[PDB]
RNA sequence: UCGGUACGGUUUGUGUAGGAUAGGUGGGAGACUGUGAAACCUCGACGCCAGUUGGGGCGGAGUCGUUGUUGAAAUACCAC
RNA sequence: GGAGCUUGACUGCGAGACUUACAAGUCAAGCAGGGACGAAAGUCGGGAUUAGUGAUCCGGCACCCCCGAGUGGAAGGGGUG
């Protein structure tokens, strides 16, 4: 697109190491207005995934939002099918689920069933795979609290995991919010990709990091800042 | 770079034949290497070595970390379960037992207690992920469309000898290993499936070694070459034009260097005859250089090599074979439907067919093994046949190469004539103390040439022989192919190597199937180069196997 | 052409033995059923490589 | 001048089905319009029977996607 | 001379002898573990017997975890094969 839009591109310098600070300010003034524009986090981490150990998998709590619809959809009977239909939950399946998933119809962006709801999901989980939309048991999606769940995706729960070629990538809100707010989900991300940290790792393991929006280019941030988001 | 392979001052020898002397190399990933060599260098021991199975004598060859090895033996195994079956065994190995674990507690975990059971569908769905292992059914109906494999429910025992090879090429390219060890990939194919194994081959992330006889396999694999000399390995890169050269170059200069050291040994025999004189000494230094010097002119005999030679058979007459209005088939299937041809007489018969097309259940229904289901063979009183099968009888793998060919006897019958038996093997290579080996450690290039033994003391005069050019290196196929031409009988060969068929051949069979019938053949009055031009006056996008 | 050989046992893989075989009787690995003083028992010893 | 490393720009990928040449992951309903939106023609690059784009009609009308379709996976565009 | 099953071509020891300048060389019933064969008694620590070989030093390897130069390790040494 070597277009008029470059415009937008001249103020990003590649070889000035910004903050995270500046990199929500230059966030705001690269994305235009007509899209609402999502700002995104592409790490690229110094781990090898061919071995199974060194595997980046985990989630986060971002404690501002994310400024998505979060479409859930809940195998669950009983009680546990009220509770999730008055947590907020606009499709809240049951064993029915099994033929309308399958007939092509996969309208939602994260599951949550109980284990014993668990034992009709998984032979239709051919198409729910390769997708992302699975169950899985780590991020409080299989469990019998399926109340709190539902908050949490509304909360801003966000599901990285590191791609074969050692990319993580991640959202962090959108561009109508603060300058300061997208560093406080910025910054409660970092220190939740530490603790996941293998510890057989070789050399530097945030190697080199850049944010950017749906269609801004890219914006080089500092790999050494890891304290000071505020 | 980090490499895949490596090997540090590597020495394995088998007493008195060397195969490795102090070698050092590495393979890194990406490396398109095609080993060659003749028989008895040591390609095959080789190649496992660096698969796990043999270990050295001393050194080192060890393994980079990760980096799993897949190895197609020269002669590779099979299950007894079904073809479907067969490939699962490797490539999909490991990964079906997860499958078969998580759809296991699918129903377990339900009716049982689901704490500890939570994680265990959660590490298993945790490596169906980076796998990808969700449409592990549709993996494997892919495999099989691209080397064009035979049915999924039928047994591994009524296949071809190609068609052995197909499923066993499934296996390891569905691994995909980080060092492929291709043990005669080419054997037994057609010219279809190896056109696809050298497209498969070029893009392809790992090494590949591959030690090949021929060179149109080699020059579209392979872009280095390593030669296996006696003990020592000599890397260069090239296209096996340039390997034909320097073989020859290195045999030249040695040659005229051991003749050098032959006439300083006449000269200086003659020196130690002399006879001392008056009261001067014979010098102990001069006896000490003669004793050393003929040391070093004993570990030098290196020529040995003997012509095949056929046994001529009685005198044939005008019919050899006459086949009136063939039909055979096993089932529905259909694979000879009205064949008529008659064998001529001294001349030779190239049979031409893909895979699974019916030329071996051609030459059983000549010896009578199989029987015609319309239509009749005729033989005729002349006729002395000599033919083996691959599967019947075959070897057996723990009686010496001596009693293979004899049954324990000192002198054989060859056909009316009297032959000493080690006099006999002795003319087909296995000389000296080698008559002892039993069938389970001869290499590839001593089996295709045991089995000619087996064959040619039956003494006939029209001999069937089921693809001869196997794993003969270019120096005794050139010696077969010599012998085919002075026998004064009818031969019949089937082969795939399509310049040996060009060369020897004066009558080709062939395939000319179709859509609309599939069983018919054609015999042709000529050569093969002769055939390819006259069968364009009668009268494609490489499948993936992944994604 | 007779080479020395040690025997190790299949469950401790202790080197037990020193014999010599037939490298060209006998190509493949000895087999044998002798006395481990570690187990204690006579135990199926094997060949090295 | 010829090689190495670091950083950056453009480019490259064809089953079997699917307008057809779908590299991997995430975002995504809009991306662009001082021109190749239409539009032909020539010429240079790659090749699996086509996608690469220096521009002559020139800046005026509509191309692409969001839908549907097929499949393991979707089409713009951007980020690594 | 022939056939059946097998690995005692053992581990821990060995009173007492032959030979002998020394160093070496040779025989040994019998006790215990764990086995083979035999219905048992029993026999088996390679071959009918005597040749088929090489001291010590210095090194290699597997095992035992014995010492570990301030202490915990490790390096290197040590034992048995
Ligand atoms: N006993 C049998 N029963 C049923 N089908 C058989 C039997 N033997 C062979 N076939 C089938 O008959 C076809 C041809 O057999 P065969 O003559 O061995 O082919 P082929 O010429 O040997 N193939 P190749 O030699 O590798 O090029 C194949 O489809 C085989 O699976
Ligand atoms: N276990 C063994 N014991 C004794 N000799 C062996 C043993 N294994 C292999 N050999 C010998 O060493 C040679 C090495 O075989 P090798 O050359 O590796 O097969 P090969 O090179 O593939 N023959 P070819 O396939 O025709 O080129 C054999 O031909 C035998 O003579
Ligand atoms: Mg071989
Ligand atoms: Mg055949
Ligand atoms: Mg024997
Ligand atoms: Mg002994
Ligand atoms: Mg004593
Ligand atoms: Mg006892
Ligand atoms: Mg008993
Ligand atoms: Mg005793
Ligand atoms: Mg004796
Ligand atoms: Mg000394
Ligand atoms: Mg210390
Ligand atoms: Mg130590
Ligand atoms: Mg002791
Ligand atoms: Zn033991």
């Not at chain 2, 025992?157 to 052995?164: D, F, K, P, V």
């Not at chain 2, 296995?430 to 064959?455: I, W, Y």
Request: charged share 30%; glycine share 8%; net charge neutral.
């Amino acid at each position: 697109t070597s277009k008029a839009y470059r415009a937008a591109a001249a103020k990003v310098d590649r070889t000035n190491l910004y903050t995270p600070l500046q990199a929500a300010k230059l966030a705001k003034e690269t994305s235009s207005t007509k899209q609402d524009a999502t700002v995104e986090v592409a790490i690229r981490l110094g781990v090898d995934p061919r071995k199974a150990d060194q595997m980046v998998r985990g989630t986060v709590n971002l404690p501002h939002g994310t400024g998505k619809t979060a479409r859930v959809a809940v195998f669950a009977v009983g009680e546990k099918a009220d509770a999730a239909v008055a947590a907020g939950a606009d499709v809240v399946g049951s064993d029915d689920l099994i033929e309308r998933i399958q007939g092509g119809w996969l309208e939602f962006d994260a599951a949550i069933a109980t284990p014993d709801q668990m034992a009709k999901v998984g032979r239709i989980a051919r198409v729910l795979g390769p997708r992302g939309l699975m169950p899985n048991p780590k991020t409080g999606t299989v469990t019998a609290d399926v109340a709190k769940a539902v908050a949490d995706i509304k909360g801003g729960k966000i599901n990285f995991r590191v791609d074969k070629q050692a990319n993580l990538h991640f959202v962090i809100g959108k561009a109508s919010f603060d300058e300061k707010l997208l560093a406080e989900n910025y910054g409660a991300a970092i220190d939740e990709v530490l603790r996941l940290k293998p510890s057989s790792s070789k050399g530097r393991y945030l190697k080199k990091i850049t944010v950017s929006t749906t269609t801004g280019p890219g914006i080089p941030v500092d790999p050494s800042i890891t304290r000071n988001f505020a | 770079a980090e490499f895949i392979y490596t090997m540090k001052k590597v020495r394995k020898a088998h007493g008195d034949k060397v195969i490795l002397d102090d070698v050092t190399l590495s393979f890194y990933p990406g490396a398109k290497i095609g080993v060659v060599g003749p028989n008895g260098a040591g390609k095959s021991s080789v190649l496992r070595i660096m698969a796990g199975l043999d270990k050295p004598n001393n050194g080192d060859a060890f393994l980079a970390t990760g980096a799993t090895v897949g190895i197609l033996q020269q002669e590779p195994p099979l299950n007894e379960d079904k073809t479907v079956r067969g490939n699962v065994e490797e490539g999909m190995g490991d990964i079906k037992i997860k499958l078969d674990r998580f759809n296991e507690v699918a129903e377990l975990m339900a009716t049982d207690y689901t704490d500890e059971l939570m994680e265990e569908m959660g590490r298993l769905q945790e490596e169906l992920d980076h796998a990808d292992a969700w449409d592990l059914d549709a993996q494997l109906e892919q495999a099989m469309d691209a080397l064009r494999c035979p049915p999924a429910d039928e047994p591994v025992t009524n296949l071809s000898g190609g068609e052995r090879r197909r499923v066993a090429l499934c296996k390891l390219l569905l691994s995909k290993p980080d060092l492929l060890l291709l043990d005669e990939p080419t054997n037994h194919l057609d010219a279809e499936s190896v056109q696809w194994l050298e497209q498969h081959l070029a893009s392809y992330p790992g090494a590949i070694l591959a030690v090949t006889h021929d060179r149109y396999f080699l020059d579209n694999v392979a872009e280095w070459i390593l030669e296996l000399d006696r003990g020592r390995a000599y890397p260069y890169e090239g296209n096996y034009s340039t390997y034909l050269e320097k073989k020859a170059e290195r045999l030249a200069v040695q040659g005229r260097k051991d003749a050098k050291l032959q006439k300083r040994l006449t000269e200086e025999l003659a020196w130690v005859r002399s006879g001392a004189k008056a009261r001067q000494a014979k010098s102990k230094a001069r006896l000490q250089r003669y004793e050393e010097m003929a040391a070093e002119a004993e570990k030098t005999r290196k020529l040995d090599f003997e012509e095949i030679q056929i046994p001529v058979g009685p005198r044939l007459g005008n019919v050899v074979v006459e086949v009136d209005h063939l039909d055979k088939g096993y089932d529905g299937r259909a694979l000879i439907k009205d064949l008529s041809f008659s064998l001529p007489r001294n001349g030779i018969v190239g049979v031409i067919g893909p895979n699974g097309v019916g030329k071996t259940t051609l030459f059983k229904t000549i010896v009578g093994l199989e029987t015609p289901d319309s239509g009749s063979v005729k033989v005729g009183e002349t006729v002395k046949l000599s033919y083996v099968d691959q599967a019947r009888a075959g070897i057996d793998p723990r009686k010496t190469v001596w009693e293979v060919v004899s049954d324990g006897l000192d002198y054989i019958q060859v056909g009316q004539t009297e032959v000493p038996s080690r006099a006999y093997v002795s003319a087909f290579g296995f000389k000296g103390p080698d008559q002892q080996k039993p069938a389970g450690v001869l290499s590839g290039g001593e089996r295709n040439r045991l089995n000619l033994a087996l064959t040619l003391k039956q003494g006939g005069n029209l001999i069937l022989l089921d693809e001869p050019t196997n794993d003969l290196d270019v120096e005794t196929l050139g010696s077969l192919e010599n012998a085919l031409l002075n026998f004064p009988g009818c031969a019949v060969v089937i082969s795939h190597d399509r310049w040996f068929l060009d060369r020897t051949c004066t009558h080709i069979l062939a395939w000319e199937g179709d859509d609309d019938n599939e069983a018919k053949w054609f015999w042709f009055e000529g050569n093969f180069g002769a055939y390819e031009e006259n069968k364009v006056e009668r009268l494609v996008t490489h499948r993936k196997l992944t994604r | 052409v007779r080479p020395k050989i040690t025997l190790a046992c299949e469950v401790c893989k202790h080197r037990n033995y020193i014999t010599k075989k037939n490298r060209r009787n006998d190509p493949d690995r000895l087999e044998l059923k002798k006395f481990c003083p570690n187990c204690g028992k006579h135990q199926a010893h094997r060949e090295t490589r």
